[PDB]
Amino acid sequence: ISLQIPIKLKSVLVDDWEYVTKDKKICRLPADVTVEMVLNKYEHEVSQELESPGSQSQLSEYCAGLKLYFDKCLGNMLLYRLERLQYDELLKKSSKDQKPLVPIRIYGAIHLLRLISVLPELISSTTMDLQSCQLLIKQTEDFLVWLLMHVDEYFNDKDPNRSDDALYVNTSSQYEGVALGM
C-alpha cells in the first residue's frame, strides 16, 4: 500500500535505471556482496537485539521468504531487456556444470532493492489479508531503514573505465547487438 522508500534509495534505483537503459551497462556478476550475504548480515545484526520470541522468529521467516521470492522472481520480473543476455549466459554456464542456478548467490543488493519496489504492486494482485499486509510493509520498511543506514558499503560510486572492481561493466558492441537486436 504505502511503502516509504527513502529518498536516497529511490535515487539509487533511478541511477541503476539510467545506467542500464541509457549508458548500456550491466551488473558485474557474480556480485561481491550477493543477496544472501547482505540478508544474513541484516538478520545476524538485528535479531540479536530483539528479545520477543515472535519478533525474533518472524524476522527469520521474513528473511527466508525474501530469499525464496527473490530466487523465484528474479528471472521473471527483475531484469531489463539488456540484462537478459547475462542471464542466458549464466544459465548456459550453469547447465554446462550440472549446477542449478541460484540467483540469490549471484546477484546482490541492487536487484534486491529493485525487488522491493514493486512489492506494493505485487501484493495488490493477491487475496492478502489486511492484518498481514501491514506486517509485511512494516518489516520491509525496517529492512529499508537498515539498508539506508548501511548505504556506503553496498552502493559505491565507481567508474567502470577506471576500476575493474566497479559494480557495473560496459557491454561490448557484439553483446549489445545480440541483446537488443535479435
Binding site: 558492441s173 557484439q174 547487438g177 545480440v178 537486436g181
Partner: protein
C-alpha cells in the same frame, strides 16, 4: 629518386559487386588499371598477382568465429545465420554478396604481400588499390569493410620495422585502424577526417591514445567543402612534425577517393592535384612506402586520381589527354585526366585550424 615500385593487381577483383544501389564498387579498381596500362606505366613497374590470404592470416586480427562466419555466409543461406548477422553487423549497410570471402582474401593477400616485399627489400614503394578497407574492427563489419587488411599489412611491417606511420586522407575517420593500435606506441595513426554528425562519429581532437600509446594517435577534424590550398596548409605542417618528432621506419598511406569533389557520400572539395599532392609530398621523405586505395564512390574521379597518383609515384607526370582505354565513355565531357572542384562554400577558417594545429602540436610535443 626514381624508386622501384611494386604493383599488385588481381584481374578478378573487379568481378565482385555489392548490391545494385550500393555506392561501393570494386569495378573502379579495374578501370584504374586500364588508365595505368594504357598510359604505358607497366614498362616502369613490376606487376604482381599477390597470393590470396588464408584464414589463419586474417585471424592475426579478427576472431576465429568472425572469419568462420565470413567464409560460409552466402546470400542463399543467410537465414541460417541470424544471431551471427546481428552480432557481426553483416546486415544492410555491409551486405552479403556472391564473392565476399574471395574479395576479402584478395585484398588481404595484396596488402600482406606488399608489406612482405617492403620487408625483404624487393622495393621501396608498394601499391595495392584493392585494400584500404579501414572500418572493420576485429569482430564486425563496418562502413562497407569486412576485413581490415591495413591492420594485417601493418602487423607484417612491424616484424622488420620498429615503428610504422599510418596516414589516412579519407573523409571518414580511420576507426578500425586507430582502434587496433590505440594502446601500442609502435603504430602511429594520423587521420584527416570530416567530424560532425558524420558516419564515423568518432575521432575527436582529444582522442590521443590510452596507456603506453598516449599521444600516439592524431585526429584532424575538418568542416565541409575544404579546398586544395587549405587541405595542403593543414596536411603539410602536421605530417612534417610527425616525421620530425616520431621518425617512422615505414609509412602506409590510405588514398581514399571520398575527399575528391563530386563524391556520392563525401562532402570535401579536393581536386585531383589537391588529392595527389598529399601522396607526392609524403613520398618526398625517403622512407619505405605502402599506398592503398580506400574510399571513393564516383568511379571515374577515383580511377583518374588513382592513375595520376601511380604516375606521380613513378616519378613522371601524366598528360591531360586520355589514352583511349576500354572504359572511355565513363569520362564524360572532355575526356581529360582531371577532376573539377566545384564552387561550394568552404567553412574551415584560419582561426579554427590554428586552434586545431596548436592542440595537435602540444600533443605531439611528447613523442620524441
Amino acid at each position: 629518386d626514381k624508386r622501384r615500385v611494386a604493383y599488385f593487381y588481381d584481374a578478378d577483383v573487379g568481378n565482385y559487386a555489392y548490391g545494385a544501389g550500393h555506392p561501393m564498387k570494386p569495378h573502379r579498381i579495374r578501370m584504374a588499371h586500364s588508365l595505368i596500362m594504357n598510359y604505358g606505366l607497366y614498362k616502369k613497374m613490376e606487376i604482381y598477382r599477390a597470393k590470396p590470404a588464408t584464414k589463419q592470416e586474417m585471424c592475426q586480427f579478427h576472431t576465429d568465429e568472425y572469419i568462420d562466419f565470413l567464409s560460409r555466409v552466402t546470400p542463399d543461406n543467410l537465414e541460417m545465420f541470424k544471431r551471427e548477422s546481428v552480432k557481426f553487423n553483416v546486415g544492410d549497410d555491409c551486405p552479403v554478396f556472391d564473392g565476399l570471402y574471395e574479395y576479402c582474401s584478395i585484398s588481404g593477400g595484396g596488402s600482406m604481400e606488399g608489406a612482405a616485399r617492403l620487408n625483404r627489400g624487393k622495393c621501396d614503394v608498394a601499391v595495392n588499390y584493392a585494400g584500404g578497407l579501414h572500418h572493420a574492427k576485429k569482430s564486425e563489419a563496418s562502413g562497407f569493410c569486412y576485413l581490415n587488411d591495413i591492420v594485417l599489412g601493418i602487423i607484417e611491417l612491424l616484424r622488420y620495422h620498429p615503428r610504422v606511420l599510418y596516414i589516412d586522407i579519407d573523409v571518414h575517420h580511420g576507426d578500425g585502424v586507430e582502434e587496433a593500435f590505440y594502446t601500442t606506441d609502435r603504430v602511429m595513426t594520423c587521420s584527416f577526417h570530416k567530424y560532425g554528425e558524420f558516419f564515423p562519429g568518432t575521432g575527436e581532437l582529444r582522442d590521443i591514445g590510452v596507456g603506453a600509446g598516449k599521444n600516439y594517435a592524431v585526429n584532424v577534424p575538418l568542416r565541409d567543402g575544404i579546398d586544395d590550398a587549405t587541405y595542403r596548409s593543414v596536411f603539410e605542417p602536421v605530417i612534417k612534425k610527425i616525421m620530425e618528432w616520431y621518425q617512422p621506419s615505414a609509412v602506409v598511406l590510405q588514398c581514399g577517393g571520398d575527399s575528391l569533389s563530386g563524391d556520392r557520400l563525401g562532402c570535401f572539395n579536393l581536386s585531383m592535384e589537391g588529392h595527389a599532392n598529399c601522396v607526392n609530398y609524403v613520398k618526398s621523405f625517403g622512407i619505405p612506402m605502402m599506398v592503398v586505395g580506400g574510399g571513393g564512390y564516383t568511379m571515374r574521379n577515383v580511377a583518374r586520381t588513382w592513375c595520376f597518383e601511380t604516375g606521380l609515384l613513378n616519378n613522371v607526370v601524366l598528360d591531360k589527354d586520355l589514352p583511349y582505354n576500354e572504359y572511355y565513355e565513363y569520362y564524360g565531357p572532355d575526356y581529360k585526366l582531371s577532376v573539377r572542384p566545384s564552387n561550394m562554400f568552404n567553412v574551415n577558417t584560419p582561426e579554427y585550424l590554428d586552434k586545431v594545429m596548436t592542440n595537435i602540436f602540444a600533443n605531439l610535443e611528447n613523442t620524441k
